[PDB]
Amino acid sequence: LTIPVLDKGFVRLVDQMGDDRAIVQAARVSYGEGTKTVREDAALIDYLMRHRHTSPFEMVVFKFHVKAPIFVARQWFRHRTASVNEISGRYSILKEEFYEPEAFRKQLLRKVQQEAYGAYRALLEKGVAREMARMVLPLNLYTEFYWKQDLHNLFHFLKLRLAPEAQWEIRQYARAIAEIVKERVPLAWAAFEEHLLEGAFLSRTELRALRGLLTPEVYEKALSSLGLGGSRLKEALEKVFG
Amino acid sequence: LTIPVLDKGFVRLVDQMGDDRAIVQAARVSYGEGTKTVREDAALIDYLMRHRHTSPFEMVVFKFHVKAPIFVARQWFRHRTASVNEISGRYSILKEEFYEPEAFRLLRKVQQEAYGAYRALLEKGVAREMARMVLPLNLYTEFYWKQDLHNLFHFLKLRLAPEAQWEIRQYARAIAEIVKERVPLAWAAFEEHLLEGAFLSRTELRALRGLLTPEVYEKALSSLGLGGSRLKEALEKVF
Amino acid sequence: LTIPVLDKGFVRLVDQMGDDRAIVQAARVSYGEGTKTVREDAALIDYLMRHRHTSPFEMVVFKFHVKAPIFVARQWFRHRTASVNEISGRYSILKEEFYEPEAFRKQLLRKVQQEAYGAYRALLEKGVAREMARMVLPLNLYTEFYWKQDLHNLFHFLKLRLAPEAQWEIRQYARAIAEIVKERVPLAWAAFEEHLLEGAFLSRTELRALRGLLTPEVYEKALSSLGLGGSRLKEALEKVFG
Amino acid sequence: LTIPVLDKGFVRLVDQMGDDRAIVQAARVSYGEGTKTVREDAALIDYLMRHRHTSPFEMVVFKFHVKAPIFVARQWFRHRTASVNEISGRYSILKEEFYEPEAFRLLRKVQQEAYGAYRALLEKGVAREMARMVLPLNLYTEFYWKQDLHNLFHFLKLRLAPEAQWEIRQYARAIAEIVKERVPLAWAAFEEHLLEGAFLSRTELRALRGLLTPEVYEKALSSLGLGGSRLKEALEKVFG
Ligand SMILES: Cc1cc2nc3c(=O)[nH]c(=O)nc-3n(C[C@H](O)[C@H](O)[C@H](O)COP(=O)(O)OP(=O)(O)OC[C@H]3O[C@@H](n4cnc5c(N)ncnc54)[C@H](O)[C@@H]3O)c2cc1C
Ligand SMILES: Cc1cc2nc3c(=O)[nH]c(=O)nc-3n(C[C@H](O)[C@H](O)[C@H](O)COP(=O)(O)OP(=O)(O)OC[C@H]3O[C@@H](n4cnc5c(N)ncnc54)[C@H](O)[C@@H]3O)c2cc1C
Ligand SMILES: Cc1cc2nc3c(=O)[nH]c(=O)nc-3n(C[C@H](O)[C@H](O)[C@H](O)COP(=O)(O)OP(=O)(O)OC[C@H]3O[C@@H](n4cnc5c(N)ncnc54)[C@H](O)[C@@H]3O)c2cc1C
Ligand SMILES: Cc1cc2nc3c(=O)[nH]c(=O)nc-3n(C[C@H](O)[C@H](O)[C@H](O)COP(=O)(O)OP(=O)(O)OC[C@H]3O[C@@H](n4cnc5c(N)ncnc54)[C@H](O)[C@@H]3O)c2cc1C
Fold first, then answer.
1. Residues D71, A23: Cα–Cα separation, whole Å
2. Nearest Cα to B17, choosing from A106, A71, A149, A213?
3. Which residues bind dUMP (chains A, C)?
4. Comparing C-alpha atoms, which of D70, C210, C182, B166 is closest to residue A218?
5. Which region, left, alpha or beta, applies to residue C29 given φ > 0 means left and ψ of -120 to 50 means alpha?
6. Which of B193, B195, B192 is nearest to B169 (CA)?
7. CA-closest candidate to residue C194, choices B120, B164, A201
8. Which pairing describes strands C200-202 and A200-202: parallel, antiparallel, or unpaired?
9. In the sheet that B140-148 helps form, which strands lie side by side, from edge to edge?
């Protein structure tokens, strides 16, 4: 599917290798389908996410067609674990598409975009090579590329770009992607949402504050109260005390 | 697709993402199929290969289920650009199957003793993670292996080579056969430009420059089929 | 610079590029030393770590000479973000060096080893190729290699292999590495220990538990008590109470 | 130490882990120095480079401090096998510096308006992460770049080539100069087998075959000092 982002950008799922069944299959190193029952697979998938057994999640891959402003592309490319192919401003002539914000944030644009695209056109008409000509163009220029990444590293990407510390523009792109992943690998996504996205890492002193303020028994009741049992429960306790 | 390798192992294709069309499609950063006639695309594929524009080749991925003896897997795992998930000797119990070579480029004795001490330790209740410890390096293991085409070619170029230990090479042969059928246009380009090709040093080229002449070389090249940018490029590598 | 592990293994620092000052220098992109003050830098380091600004940590690199049992090596190499060069069992004669456990964990060795090695020299004596002959040796055979990895990934490796869930044998190796690293980049290690090794990751239901069992004002006092104040206290609090 | 590039850029060696000795030392998994004679270590380095035994080359690491135009940095960052930390336009205020090309293959006006708008945006209280989007691709950026010798070599092979864009080719030339000085043996081998060598497809080695003979080839090869294993290799690529 395709999803619009910003004024002129988008995210489109080009291909996909495997779904929730693939994670479980690779985890069981099966000769066949490697599946069982959905709550059993959800359980296994939940377990793998919890214990950082990441290999199984790398057996699923997504490939997208993304159109975005160069400044968003650069933050996106900071992620080295992916395969990318971008439209080169060296061979191709660049389309006059710019990202115009809904509104600027605290803490003229149209003009410089014009002058600049003017200069770009002028330079080109004088015969100046493309590769050099495109330098006078601003960072809000749109650009397209193919982004290929495995589920494990895509979750990593989402955790970072979905965080409120990531620049708003790229957050929106991460939201689009998150939506596509949620529909395509719902079980894996369920685990990701529960354990990482909606979770939090606590430093040593934080865990130490939990101790002193609470006892095992008390914590346990509170947890089971919410529906945790067996390993999940034991582990949750072993995270604070054991 | 489950090709056998060795007396008990095998290489099987679990899944694949994209084919020759995907290489071209990604190279063009298409909104649709991203294709054209099989002549333009195979041409584009050969070109990308030649010029090291390798990204497009990374847009195609294969995932195999492999069974091989541990000592073969250790060599296989030196390749880091891949994802793998193997049967943990920690969690599960290991089947009694070893690599019994057909010819040698007693072995029964050790395996039995080793597998014997295995059950022994297990029987006495020693942790599985320490029990398999006594198992020989020819014990069989199993794993899933996912890797993109570009890095798979790199894997093939290295493991198909005569220097590569024989066993690993068989496994590479198995894989190579599979890749060829699934990405024909790419396999060909890989077969002509890298696998069956070679890298020449500077003094090897000065030698060529000293024996042949441009005119001479051009004629022997083209008479063999080379034409187009491939001809100009091959002539520049030397002159 | 050498720390023995197990009965015949060890870990020795071969070289090192950069130290705490390198982390801080890179984060700044200096043309000079890039170092301010142990206080100010220790603060930048702790900041980068808890905020996942991992690139600066990749500017520090360690290279080790390791001797450990093959089986341990297999677990070690699962980590793909490192460079490694191992003595080949195709070119050399593996020295009859085996790992005899301190004690067996519950969840003849001498015999199998003896026999196995004898089969090895036998095959060699019969003229069998090295690469093949070594196939009859047990996974507990000692091997050697050089292992180079950057701080960021090294912390990753330590976080996983220091864990109780990890096999005892490799934990020991991790412990030796941890020592060496704690000595050379004290500030990075302190941050690591605080925000990852001794920290923990809590799921959504878990935080749901804490929130409810506690109250903002209270959690704040326990946190502040142990020293938390500032952005950390802010954060720590927000992780549980919106 | 510091090599200037273009009109305002530069390449600086910030630190280095190992030299030719570390390649050989690791290749040997040595308990100590793991080195021998400069002649044997050069021979061993040439063999590893020639047979693609690349792990040892990864034991050497270079850390650079680079200042280049954003568009140059974008090409540079295609290389994933490296660590980088760049000054962020989300935190600091970017300096007004551009790459005024000596000759092309107006620009001032756009750059001024651009920095002008950028400055006028900052003053209006606009957020840095947003204001810098009006700046052009020839704006100078800075970053640290850490890469091991093996990957660095791959990098120089591609960015030094005629195909590579001119501006990044100049940055590669600078890095090449520093590497040549610091790992001379590794460099000589890289120059000899890669940089100045060439890859020949099958039909190319086919054209060479028949159009010559093992003897007519060894002659010219030997007349260049080539002998031993190398000469056996040169011969088999065509025949063998
Ligand atoms: C709050 C915040 C502030 C930031 N500020 C800055 C800044 O000022 N300047 C700046 O340049 N960046 C900055 N970054 C970006 C950051 O440094 C990373 O480059 C980016 O977040 C990508 O994370 P990643 O590398 O782990 O993901 P990936 O690139 O996808 O890599 C994922 C993991 O794979 C491993 N890996 C992949 N490739 C390599 C490799 N070549 N070598 C070693 N290990 C590898 C690593 O363990 C890595 O963590 C900031 C990020 C955040 C969250
Ligand atoms: C003749 C010969 C002798 C050999 N002898 C030995 C030996 O004695 N001991 C031994 O251990 N190995 C030996 N090897 C193995 C060799 O050194 C490589 O480990 C193996 O060939 C894998 O090649 P690769 O790393 O390029 O493939 P990959 O592992 O898939 O990596 C591919 C490329 O990606 C990049 N890359 C991947 N991971 C990283 C990373 N973590 N950091 C930086 N860059 C990365 C590199 O550019 C690398 O070349 C030998 C190989 C040959 C051909
Ligand atoms: C509880 C538990 C159980 C496990 N069980 C098993 C098992 O049964 N079988 C098994 O084989 N393994 C198992 N593992 C190992 C696990 O699957 C990983 O292989 C290992 O933990 C390495 O983690 P890593 O890849 O993140 O570290 P690294 O290999 O150093 O990589 C670090 C990060 O860099 C990126 N990266 C590095 N290399 C690649 C690459 N080639 N492709 C894509 N991204 C890359 C990834 O984001 C990765 O997280 C288990 C681990 C745990 C904790
Ligand atoms: C003539 C030419 C034209 C080009 N045109 C374009 C273009 O139009 N658009 C465009 O986007 N790019 C283009 N490129 C860039 C090219 O596709 C590569 O991205 C770039 O040259 C880096 O090569 P590299 O990936 O091998 O270097 P590195 O990024 O350092 O990777 C080195 C090697 O390590 C391994 N590796 C590293 N990271 C990963 C990973 N995440 N997954 C799997 N394996 C990995 C691979 O084996 C890889 O070959 C072009 C290059 C050339 C030479």
1. 39
2. A149
3. 75-78, 86-90, 134, 161
4. C210
5. left
6. B195
7. A201
8. antiparallel
9. B2-5, B9-17, B61-69, B140-148, B83-86
For C19, list phi and psi in degrees, rounded to 5. -145, -165
Q: Find tokens 């293991």 and name the residue.
A: B141
Of A161, A171, A208, A232, the catalytic one is A161
Separation between Cα atoms, residue C208 and residue C229, nearest integer Å: 23
DSSP conformational letter for B136: B
Give residue ranges of A with CB < 8 Å to any B CB. Answer: 12, 14-18, 22, 25-27, 29-31, 55-56, 58-59, 61, 63, 65, 83-87, 144-146, 148, 150
Question: What count of other Cβ atoms lies within 10 Å of the Cβ of residue B235?
Answer: 16
Token pair for residue D73?
């940095």
Q: A147, A84 in Cβ contact below 8 A?
A: yes
Nearest to B131 by CA among B114, B144, B148: B114
Residue D80 marked as a ligand binder? yes
Question: Is D159 part of the annotated catalytic residue set?
Answer: yes
Are B85 and A55 in contact (CB < 8 Å)?
yes
Query: In the complex, which subunits touch B with 3 or more CB pairs below 8 angstroms?
Result: A, C, D
List % helix, strand, coil for chain B (3-state, nearest 5). Answer: 50, 20, 30
Probe residue for ligand 1, chosen from D58, D65, D85, D155 as the CB with the greatest number of ligand atoms within 8 Å: D85
User: What spatial distance separates the first Cα and last Cα of chain B, rounded to whole Å?
Assistant: 46
Residues D50, D51, D54: CA angle, nearest 5 degrees:
95
Q: Would you say D83 is a known binding-site residue? A: no
Residue C167 Cβ < 6 Å to ligand 3? no
Quote the tokens at residue B140.
Answer: 């069989």
Q: Which helix (H) or strand (E) holds A216?
A: helix A216-226
C-alpha separations of A37 from A42, A59, A176 in Å: 8, 20, 30
For chain D, report the end-to-end CA distance as a whole number of angstroms: 46
Cβ < 6 A, ligand 1 pocket = A 78-81, 153, 156, 160, 165; C 51-55, 58, 81, 150, 152-153, 156; D 80-83, 85-86, 88
Q: Tell me if A135 and D105 make a contact (CB, 8 A cut-off).
A: no
Please list, in sequence order, all residues whose beta carbon lies within 8 angstroms of the beta carbon of residue D152, skipping any fewer than 6 positions away: D62, D175, D179
Can you give the length of chain C in residues?
Answer: 242
- Identity of the residue numbered A167: Q
Resolution of the structure in the document, Å: 2.5
Token digits for B120?
A: 């022994």
Structure-token pair, residue B167: 């066993």
Which alpha helices (H) appear in C8-133, and where do they start and end?
20-28, 38-50, 70-76, 109-125, 130-133
Question: Pick from A160, A208, A227: which is nearest to C205 by CB?
Answer: A227
